[PDB]
Amino acid sequence: PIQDLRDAIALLQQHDNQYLETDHPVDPNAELAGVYRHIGAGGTVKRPTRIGPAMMFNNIKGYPHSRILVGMHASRQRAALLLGCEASQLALEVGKAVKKPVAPVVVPASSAPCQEQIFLADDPDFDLRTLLPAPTNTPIDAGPFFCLGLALASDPVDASLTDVTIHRLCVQGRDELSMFLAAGRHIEVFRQKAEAAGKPLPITINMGLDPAIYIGACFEAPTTPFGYNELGVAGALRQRPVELVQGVSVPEKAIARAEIVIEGELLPGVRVREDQHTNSGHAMPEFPGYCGGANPSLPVIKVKAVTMRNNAILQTLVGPGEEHTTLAGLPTEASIWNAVEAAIPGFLQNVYAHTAGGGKFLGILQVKKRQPADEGRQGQAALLALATYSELKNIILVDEDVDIFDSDDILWAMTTRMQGDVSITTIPGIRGHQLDPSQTPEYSPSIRGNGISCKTIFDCTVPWALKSHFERAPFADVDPRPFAPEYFARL
Template sequence: MAGRAPTDLRHALACLDPLPGELVRVTEELPARYGVSAHYARWAGAPAAPPTGPGPAVLFDRVRPDHGPTRAVLMGLYGTRRRAAGLLGCTPAELPHRLLAAVRSPHPPVPAADPAGWPRETLPLDLTALPVPVLTDEDAGPYLTLGAVLATDPETGVRNLSVHRMCVQGPDTLTIWMVPGRDLELAYRAALRRGAPLPVAIHLGLGPAVLLSSCCPTALVPPSIDELAVAGALAGQPVELLRCRTVDAEFIAHAEYVIEGELLADTAPESRHGTVATPEFLGYQGRAHPSLPLVRVTAITARERPILQAVSGPGHEQSVLLGFGMEAAVLDLLERRGTPARAVHCHTAGGGQLMVVLQWPAKRGPQDDATVRAAAEAVLTEFRMAKLVLCVDEDVDVESDQDLWWAMATRFQADLDMVVLSDREGFALDPSQHTGYSRALSADGRTAKAVFDCTVPYAQRARFRRPRFTEVTAPAPRRPAAPLPR
């Protein structure tokens, strides 16, 4: 998968197709309601409930909605860190550095040079005819789990591309959950102040560089930076845009599906029949919001034989997508502090956000013992969602759970090497961050945070040497000896 990053989703799948075990095609017809998610669960990976594990990208060729024709659905394209990074021609350790470089040297998007090269058909204005998965029988309805919303802030003129949870409420309506204070919500509030809806283009099925850029945190991509410009730098070529047909907005030319619409002042309950929304990325069933803004859909367009891309909420894939941007943001923080880490790994067990592994270069003196801990505490303070930081030395493989647990078992004493920060701002989707769980918390959504320092103290370094095995070149095969003369 080396070379230039795939421009679109189809190019990405073509890169995987010849690689053994990377792409599975399911040709049997499956229902969008429960069928796709149940079939994919064996590969979803933690934090999905066992038995499960990271696996291939899975292309379901014939997924049947409640009504309408069967269409293709893709899940698991980013189901492993190695595959996600490989689609951009790098390793998992290299990708956060690539993201950081793209943020620092963005390539702005451009109008499509040849609009006719991106032909699209107009589909019936009916979301319920699309193969949008319903993950469990408790879900509020079909959810766009990987819908990337493109909108322009009417006050700043800056675009924002971000992925949001959207529930199909009817043929032409969606509810949308926006994190308060993030870029799309700010643009929405700006539009409301002007007394107008916010035009949006919702994309399903995008190229790897665009989708990964859309998942970056604000700490890495502030509101003044266009995520599409980051994607252009990451892909090595600018993202091409076209004008929407029914609203004053742009859309990404290579998208498989585009849902045009307006983000309204009107609201509706996320679920009309219970308290459950859909499974969350931390592995628990999500709670429905009593009131969310509505999107009124004005058009649905698609490429020929479109592929609808989705994720399983409590699965490895969503954590992978969130983790790389978080890693780049942590790298940036540590560089600005003058304490650069050798590597940062946001573990998928923490949803790519809550559990951060910091790998440090060799300590140069006893002062580095304190430096490591201070830097780890800075990460917990700067990033609201970071809950646990595990510090390891350069001889520990941050991608190996075995190596991480080995470091914890042999380089950690709980009464010396753990730092606890009490009652800090956290993330309410973690059910332990609740006053009913801990009386020490002043409010729901607050948490205790911890540093696990599994680095070797500088003065003790000689006692912790791992054995190294010498590479030996195998001898060339010997020729049979010539027979002795008689």
């Protein structure tokens, strides 16, 4: 029963090519990410790249006591193994946990390995920059980043209002991090409330976690009093409550079994240029595959303490590549599943938040026309997808004999089951996502500002009345294995 990051590493070590360690010295600045680019970053990272093992770097230059984990979630198959289901059903299996969550519980400090070591920022010798190897993903980044920081925080006026969300933070100084907070999201609203009263907002950043927690926390959750409800998904996935502990230096909870916890406060009335120390003009690589722009005005966590386990692992990601595809893509798929299946039961066979869109921009919907009235519902399923997940950009529709996880087979449906002046429907001027660099006025006369897009539905389903002409060549069913057993061993 997996309850923390090390229980997960143990499971991976029982399967081939899921976990890999190296003792060869690596520089956290640029080099480590450059290495994993080849081994397992995947997704929208520039070629060459591939799906591979999660990888542990034991020998980090300048950090003789540290080790860095990347790629834990950077494969769909791997995520399936870590949660005990089939990779094609991963979105549905987690969607079931979302529906029957198990609440987290509070434990005492004696039960929290994340507090086996406490480094108070009090200490004159404290220096976040030398305590933690925060990797730099590319040389043009704004600085070192932590990329899997699970932030816990509460409303400053109503303490029963909580939030759990993944963030990335740039290291800005001996005890400072900058942190981008999405407008409108709960923790930013918390921070705006505290700042309007001139007060800091206490927060914990929890890194190195059971992958069920990271995966579960990307889904929308209900809000109950003191609920930290995102944690309920992982509670359901393991059938064991996620354990919280009180912070040592701030009045906010932290993840009891996390590897590293950064406790601090968002400062009132303070802001920094994200790239103030490099003037690179960039932040770090974004899920579409491009380096984003540096944010000119960011809030700052003032660090009051770092607590960690003995031999703490620092967990982050590279790419963000396939690791982002998994964390973002399963929620994208679940919400599309839920919307289509409630409106058109039995129609959708599956949906894939394609890695080529980082799990957000590109939806592949596999439908089955069962009867004459299903003609015209394939467009309806596309409208449902675009309405339910507004950061989507394009939809590709295929039938149930097309493998939506096989990009060759998607392009095959786009070649023999599509006519350009019939099957392609453009929907201009719909808000999409600012990190798509083609969503700009300069790219298109129908785009009125950044993050607005034309959204395109590629209908590659066979028209109902023509289906008799579109049967794929029927090869006979045979068990191939007796013909070459040793060859099918390689699985």
